[PDB]
Amino acid sequence: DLADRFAELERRYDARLGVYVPATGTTAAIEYRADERFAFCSTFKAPLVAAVLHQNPLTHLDKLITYTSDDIRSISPVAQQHVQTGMTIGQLCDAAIRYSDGTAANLLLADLGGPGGGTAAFTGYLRSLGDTVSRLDAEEPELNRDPPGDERDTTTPHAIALVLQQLVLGNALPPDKRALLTDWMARNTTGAKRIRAGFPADWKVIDKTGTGDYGRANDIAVVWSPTGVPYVVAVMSDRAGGGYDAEPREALLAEAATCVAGVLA
Ligand SMILES: *C(=O)[C@@H]([C@@H]1N=C(C(=O)O)[C@@H](S[C@@H]2CN[C@H](C(=O)N(C)C)C2)[C@@H]1C)[C@@H](C)O
C-alpha cells in the first residue's frame, strides 16, 4: 500500500512528502499530498529554460551575457568560474539545469525580463501551460527562504508534473528546443541520490533537483522503462519540524522513488 509506505517515510525523516505521477495508458495516477504546496526551490529552472528557449530564436543560445561580483549571490558552481569571461545563454541554461547554478538562473530570469526581474513572465509561462497553481515571486537566494506554508515561490507535485510532462513529452516546445531541454536534464549532475537512485539502471532518468531551507529536497524527473514507456515523477519534501536549518534528506526522495518504481515496473 503506497500511501502507508509514504506515511512511514514521513515519520522516518520527520518530513512532509509530496508525490505525483500522471496517469498513463494503463497506470492510474500516483498521488500523495499531490495538491499541497511545496517550495519550488531550483526545480523552477527546468521550466525557466523552456521559457527562455520558447521566447527566442534558437541562436539566442549564442548570445554572450556578462556579469560581475555583485551578481553572485547564491550557490553558482559554474558562474563563479566564468565571471571574468561571461557566459552565453546556452552556457547559462546548461549550468542552471546541470549544476543547479543560482546566478545562471537569475541571469536567465533577467533575460526573460519584465516585472519582478523576470518572475512575473516566468509565472506567465506556467499559466500558458495551464498551470493556475504555481507562482514564482523572488529570485535567488530569496526564493528558497519562504517560511513553511507561505505560498510564495511554490508549486505542487501535481502542477509541476503536468508542466514537465508538456515540456518533455508533449508539444509545449518545438522538437529542436524540446531536445535541448531533455538533453540538459539527461546530463544533470545533481540527481544521482534522488529519483535516479530509486529506478533500476536499465530505466532512463532525466531530472532537475531542488534543495532549500527547512529541510527542502525536491526532484522532478521523466523516466523511461527499458521498453521506452515514459512516466513523469515529481517528488517534493520538507522537514519544517527542524526549523530553517533542518538538513535536506535526499534519502527520503530515493526511498519514495524506489516505492514508485516498484508500482511502475
Ligand atoms: C536550488 O534548489 C538551489 C541549488 N540547487 C541545488 C540542488 O538542486 O541540489 C543546490 S546546488 C547542487 C547540490 N550541491 C552542489 C554544489 O556544487 N554545491 C552545494 C556547492 C550542486 C542549491 C541549493 C538554489 C541555490 O539555486
Quote the CA–CA distance of 13 and 257 in Å, as a whole number.
15
The total number of structural domains in the chain stands at 1
The residue to mutate among 100, 103, 194, having the most atoms of ligand 1 within 8 angstroms of its beta carbon, is 100
Q: 96: CA distance to ligand 1 center in Å?
A: 10
Is the shortest distance between the CB of 75 and ligand 1 below 6 Å?
A: yes
Binding-site residue numbers are 100, 209-211
Quote the CA–CA distance of 180 and 258 in Å, as a whole number.
28
Method: X-ray
Annotate 14-62 with DSSP letters as a single string.
Answer: T-EEEEEE---SS-PPEEESTTS-EE-GGGGHHHHHHHHHHHS-GGGGG
CATH, residue 45: 3.40.710.10
The residues annotated with a catalytic role in the active site are 42, 140
Quote the CA–CA distance of 9 and 87 in Å, as a whole number.
41
- Phi and psi at residue 222, in whole multiples of 5°? -115, 130
- The secondary structure element, H or E, covering residue 64 is strand 64-65
| Nearest atom (ligand 1) to Cα of 105 | 26
Q: Is 214 helix (H, G, I), strand (E, B) or coil?
A: coil
Task: Say which residues have a Cβ less than 8 Å from residue 164's Cβ, sequence separation at least 6.
Answer: 46, 47, 220, 222, 232, 234
- The secondary structure element, H or E, covering residue 221 is strand 216-224
Range of the domain at 248: 1-265
C-alpha 137 chain-centroid distance: 16
Annotate 112-156 with DSSP letters as a single string.
Answer: H-SGGGGHHHHHHHHHHTT--S------TTGGG-PPTT--TTEE-
